[PDB]
Symmetry: none
Subunit: 229 residues, 3 copies
RNA sequence: UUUUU
């Protein structure tokens, strides 16, 4: 009767005449210690050169220490390490280091030069503003499952959904609406309740995002519109 | 004078100074017989689990029998088999079986549980409504090239443009206006004329379409909108 | 201190505790002389069969003369030659040859049969209209960096943003708003100032683009709107 | 013409 959806069952589906019918929080706690031996600067460098580093990881089977990032994006186990999972851990680690003030001055100084931080025009004032900076460009639904990261993920997802045009995010490459949906799905999965305290924290995050800011098309906007008309 | 486009002729073109100059309807007839050895239920299963199957087919060079679907999306020949072309054939196959009364009851029963049929709220009464059900989710411009499928393709395309909001179709992923245009290009290419007989058929389809009718975000929606403003 | 981005350096980044950190105008002037030995017909043929020629170059490491277009799209140097960089230069060569009247009639005659010219319905009357014809399908932000090519690039970019639907430009394949943005970034980078003389020229370009001429949907529109009104439109 | 719902 009914079988499991496998690659062979799809082949059999097409070639026979027979009737045929068909948690990251845990991952984080177990793999965070492994990357803790990285440097704060090493973490910020990974973030700073994410896109460039990503290309190198995807060239072939990238193995570092006991961990290996497979070339096959398909079939990834709860133990398996993807680039997104590696990228996310490093951000979670950096936020944890925001609990120490000495690291906060290191991160705040260095992350102020990051490409994404300037594009968002993010004001880097207090600890919450620095934490947001670490979040920029990160896999929000993944990070949202980690405790105390629920609000910071959804506020940034909302911001990315509202201002996707201003941030220059291509909707064809990144569904900014789908991302927010998955974040909410994550929170409901771990029965996250949005009481006033969570809303209290989120608005403080949103306050930083609100105060944040093409620049070239604005420089020629007065003469560009005459041709437009 | 004029020469053939070859790799060497481009080298001569760039390095010398001498003057140098250089249909799914068919696809269906040739590949439909191949998938006819499938079961009626197996076809309906493919439709029901299209998205799930889609991911698996795109995993690697998917080969079933003598046919192989390549991973390389670029450079696809008129003979080459894509997932959408496979999907289209199976729907065309299923519609052909709507000419049999035994199959009509079989298809009608199974496809009533399909996700798209329920989302559209499509009433499955007569043969034409069942045919519409099979069409849901299909590559309309492809199917439009097959004879007698012109009206059912363009009428459904028209409907998707009118009720795109009600159907929950994301404009960023699917240009619903562009879709209707591509269907018309196919029809105009084979000189299809919408006389009284054809428009009559379409109106019968349109009558059925007229009578037709995220979750995690709804949970946090009340507190979510505050950040949106 | 700072090191080069290599596969080994990423491993060191992730497994160790050490502190670890990682213009076409010039390109044109240095590479334009090389393509000058081509024929006008050779240049115009390249324009006519761009997509078909493009695929052959992408087949393998395509080498012509001392120049080689590598298959590896990643890591392209300021000296390295890509197809888009190759294609744009050929257009630049062709536009420069519009300053001579003999070539002007040759280009006008040949390029009038080219796909983009016919699809855009571009009227080929004077020299400026001919220059516009050569630009169609070209890499605008690259060419915009070449001097005297600034206004003609941004005016056409504006037009491509406004009429992207009528021109059959696929938004999933080509962000026509991003295109206009990149051109402006180039112009602001070389401090291009849009004074009265430039805008005057641009409007002459824009006038030609205005004068140029879904299509298949209008053919059925009489019996296409009858169904729209059934669905409440 | 290719791709996603």
């Amino acid at each position: 009767s009914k079988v499991k959806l496998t690659k062979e069952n799809i082949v059999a589906l097409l070639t026979q005449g027979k009737d045929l019918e068909f948690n990251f929080k845990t991952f984080c706690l177990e793999n965070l210690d492994q990357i803790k031996k990285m440097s704060i600067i090493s973490c910020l460098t990974f973030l700073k050169n994410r896109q460039s580093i990503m290309k190198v990881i995807k060239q072939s089977d990238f193995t570092f220490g006991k961990i290996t990032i497979k070339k096959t994006s398909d079939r990834i186990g709860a133990t398996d390490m993807t680039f997104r999972r590696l990228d996310s851990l490093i951000r979670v680690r950096l936020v944890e280091e925001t609990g120490n003030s000495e690291n906060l001055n290191t991160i705040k100084s260095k992350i102020a030069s990051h490409p994404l931080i300037q594009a968002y025009g993010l004001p880097l004032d207090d600890a919450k503003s620095v934490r947001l900076a670490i979040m920029l460009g990160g896999s929000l639904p993944l990070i949202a499952s980690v405790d105390s990261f629920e609000m910071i993920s959804v506020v940034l997802a909302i911001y990315q959904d509202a201002k996707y045009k201003d941030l220059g995010i291509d909707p064809k490459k990144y569904d900014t609406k789908e991302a927010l949906g998955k974040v909410c799905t994550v929170l409901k999965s771990k029965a996250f309740e949005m009481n006033e305290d969570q809303v209290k924290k989120g608005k403080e995050y949103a306050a930083i995002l609100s105060s944040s800011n093409s620049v070239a098309m604005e420089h020629y906007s007065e003469t560009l519109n005459k041709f437009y008309e």
